Paper text:
In our current work we have identified the outer membrane receptor responsible for ferredoxin and pectocin import in Pectobacterium spp., which we designate FusA. To understand the mechanism of ferredoxin import we have solved the crystal structure of FusA and two of its plant ferredoxin substrates, and using nuclear magnetic resonance (NMR)-driven molecular docking we have modelled the FusA–ferredoxin complex. The discovery of FusA demonstrates that, like their mammalian pathogenic counterparts, phytopathogenic bacteria can use a TBDR to specifically target iron-containing host proteins. In summary this study reports and the structural characterization of a TBDR receptor that binds to iron–sulphur cluster containing ferredoxin domains.
Recombinant FusA (derived from P. atrosepticum SCRI1043) was expressed in E. coli and purified and refolded from inclusion bodies to yield stable, monodisperse FusA, which was used to undertake crystallization trials. Phases were obtained and the structure solved using platinum single-wavelength anomalous dispersion data at 4.2 Å from a K2PtCl4 soaked crystal, with the final atomic model refined against native data to 3.2 Å resolution. FusA possesses a classical TBDR-fold, consisting of an N-terminal plug domain surrounded by a 22-stranded transmembrane β-barrel. However, the similarity of FusA to other TBDRs is limited to this transmembrane region, while the extracellular loops, which constitute ∼46% of the polypeptide chain, are highly divergent from any previously described protein structure. Loops 4, 5 and 7 (from the N terminus of the barrel) are the most extended and form a wall-like β-sheet, which is separated from the barrel β-sheet by a section of irregular secondary structure. Large extensions are present at the end of loops 4 and 5, which double back over the outside of the barrel. On the opposite side of FusA, loops 8–11 are also highly elongated and form extensive interactions with each other, although they lack the regular β-sheet structure of loops 4, 5 and 7. Normal mode analysis (NMA) indicates that the structures formed by these loops move between an open and closed conformation giving the extracellular portion of FusA the appearance of a baseball glove. As with other protein-binding TBDRs and in contrast to those which bind small molecules, the extracellular loop of the plug domain is highly extended, with residues 144 to 162 exposed to the external environment.
Residue numbers in the entry: 59 to 867
Write the structure that this text describes.
Amino acid sequence: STPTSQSMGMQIINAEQIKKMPTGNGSVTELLKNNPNVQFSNTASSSNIPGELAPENVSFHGEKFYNNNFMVDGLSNNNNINPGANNGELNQQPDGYSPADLPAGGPQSFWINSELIESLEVFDSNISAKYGDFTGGVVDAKTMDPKLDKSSGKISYRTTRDSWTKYHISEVISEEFYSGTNLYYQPKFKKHFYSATFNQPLSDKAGFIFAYNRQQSDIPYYHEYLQQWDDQERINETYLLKGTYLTDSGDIIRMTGMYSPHESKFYKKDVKNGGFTNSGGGYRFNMEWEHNASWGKMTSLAGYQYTEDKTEHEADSYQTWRRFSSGFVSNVIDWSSSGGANGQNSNIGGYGSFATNTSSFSLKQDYELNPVSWYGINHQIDFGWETDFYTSRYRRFSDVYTGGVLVVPTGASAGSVVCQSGDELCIPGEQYSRTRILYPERNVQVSNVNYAAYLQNSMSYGRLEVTPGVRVSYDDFLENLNIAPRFSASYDVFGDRSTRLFGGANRYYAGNILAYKMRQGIGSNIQESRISPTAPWTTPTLRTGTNYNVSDLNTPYSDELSLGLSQRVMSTVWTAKWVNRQGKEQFGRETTTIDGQSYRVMNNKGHTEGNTFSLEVEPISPHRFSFAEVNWKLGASVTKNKSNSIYYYDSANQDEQRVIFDDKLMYRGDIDAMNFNTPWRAFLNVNTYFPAVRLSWDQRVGYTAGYKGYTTSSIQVQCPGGSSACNGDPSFVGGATEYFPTQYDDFISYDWRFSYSQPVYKTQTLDITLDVLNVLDNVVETNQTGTSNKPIVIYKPGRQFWLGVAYTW
Ligand SMILES: CCCCCCCCO[C@@H]1O[C@H](CO)[C@@H](O)[C@H](O)[C@H]1O
Ligand SMILES: CCCCCCCCO[C@@H]1O[C@H](CO)[C@@H](O)[C@H](O)[C@H]1O
Ligand SMILES: CCCCCCCCO[C@@H]1O[C@H](CO)[C@@H](O)[C@H](O)[C@H]1O
Ligand SMILES: CCCCCCCCCCCC[N+](C)(C)[O-]
Ligand SMILES: CCCCCCCCCCCC[N+](C)(C)[O-]
């Protein structure tokens, strides 16, 4: 059995516990909301953005949001190229809009639905040497296994809508919002979730399981100027197939296969054929071999996993044409993109396709030895190793041409454009392009190999438990070998199990980013010119634009200290604990100069702190108090998190800037963190079951410290005189931007889930499921944008209904 000091710092959510928490989009990170050690992006749940299907972003003890280890079925599900794009916030032009974009796709490469999952193991504190490639938390999601006894199976269906959603939108925006001209202002929409599961035995000793799961979301979108309604789309799919076979020997062989594409359908604004789609996800193949020997257990795995973020546009060339201007009106340009009174231009097309992928083959092996007493104490030993050979690419699939400067001869020479038979950049009689920019077919490619091994020894003298462990890893990307001591202890103060202390000190090293590699060539373009529209294209010249590059880096780590205490007061367990995290050597941005050419490059100048006091109360067993039965759980936390100005790996170092902030003139690097920094929150869950009418009545209540919004001075406060804070440093001379707080008040969150089951033909049932999400519909500020000039507040979703129908057998 696992050591008591490590369980103290992990969560376990089995499938029946999952079904009893009320949910929107079922997604992995959503399930973390009952964990007092985690926080979410200020924008992660917002009323502007239903219809969106991605996973929320999460940060453990205020560590980076892209420094978590997300696993599925114990294997990595992390994007190690570009996971923290735009520090996790959305972009009015999602990445791929523009020709020279590095695709994003976020911290998880497979977006797995909250069905499909048997158990979720969530480690945040005193983590095991067995787990690496994180600074923050570990989030292992175990999919459904086959059963060998019966032929289970289920078909579900589930939906929500704009009708059914009550919105909260600022005014200021409400005009623009309801026009539906903004991608991420979605007033009208429909989500649809299908699922199908087949459990299937073959022998007394072998069976498989097929599962499928589709989430889809349609969002209308309008072009002013172009004057068209197009439909945005969001599709997530998961196909899953697992066999298991028990040998004559008593050893076990498993085999998994997964395919988890997701895509997002977008539109370049007011552009004829402006469409483009952003595919993500990929697939897996496992093969796993348990062996049960006299000494212990030995599980040996081989795996392969292709994952890919690709942007693909409706067309592979882009033009900007003129509809009309002084002296000119086209017979051929129907549409417009601008609406100027005296001049209108018309954009058409797009920037080809292009992508990043990672192909990777993995070989794990883990040993669980049987306990062994030696020199008077028990030795639970684990050890193991693993190695991963991977290859990352970026590719533009084919040459994409953009139109350059325009000509529109008018007046004396008004009709005189004479085109070439094939010429995509010439409209006979009207207009042509003098220059033309070619973004070329390209390819950049890394192939690497990481190695890791770990040894742990949980020893116990009775009363005591003390588990020193080591994880050693080497990435040949940075070529660093890192050694991570993990230490975790526990003491029982009087037999009993009534009163136990525990603590520990550990170090977690992160995995790779490697975006700066993939961007190396990126944004190369070759521009040509021509005198007339029958001249040949003449003077090709290669520009690179912003150049990116590799540098000599340390691997970012996080150091931990923990101390806690678990009391059993009555028939109710009160466990309270402290954790502190120094996050160190965190990647950021530098501009460096090589040969007169300049280069964006990664540094190790970021840093973070995390400090959390967490309490947790939970009764021993449910109350049967009588005609129904009720269980309950209660979490709470107090949380101070810190940060540089280096928010993520593409943030430049603006620490030495001077900034006014709360009343006194100070350096920017020392100001409060403004994402993942809610000072406290408490939450209670109550699951109620009325067996008399087969009705489940699940409620989540929560009281939460309010948001604190900031805005900034549009104009820098110049400083010898010009603010009475300039005296905080009389010598200082220069500018400084002032931050203006608005402290919103603490708020009550309240969520419901009903689930009624109903027999149909003996062994079958039909299940009705209803979620009421913001029950009181009360308004809460989540996030604040803009200068003081124009401040914009964003709110948490109002009351929302989800309706589900399941059919089991
Ligand atoms: C279980 C074995 C996997 C079977 C899935 C085969 C279908 C994969 O389809 C492919 O997947 C990649 C990422 O999704 C894309 O980049 C490819 O262009 C696409 O054709
Ligand atoms: C768990 C600890 C294992 C240590 C292995 C260190 C390997 C360092 O050795 C390097 O590894 C590269 C990638 O594998 C090779 O291609 C290089 O030739 C070699 O310099
Ligand atoms: C068994 C008792 C568990 C509680 C451990 C006390 C942890 C105190 O630890 C301290 O907490 C401060 C917060 O006020 C932080 O400012 C400091 O960084 C930290 O050293
Ligand atoms: C038994 C379940 C198998 C899943 C069937 C999925 C069928 C659709 C495959 C994708 C094709 C696109 N579209 C829009 C028709 O769905
Ligand atoms: C892991 C076993 C699952 C195998 C399923 C293979 C998917 C077949 C492709 C059908 C079309 C899928 N897509 C992307 C169009 O939706």
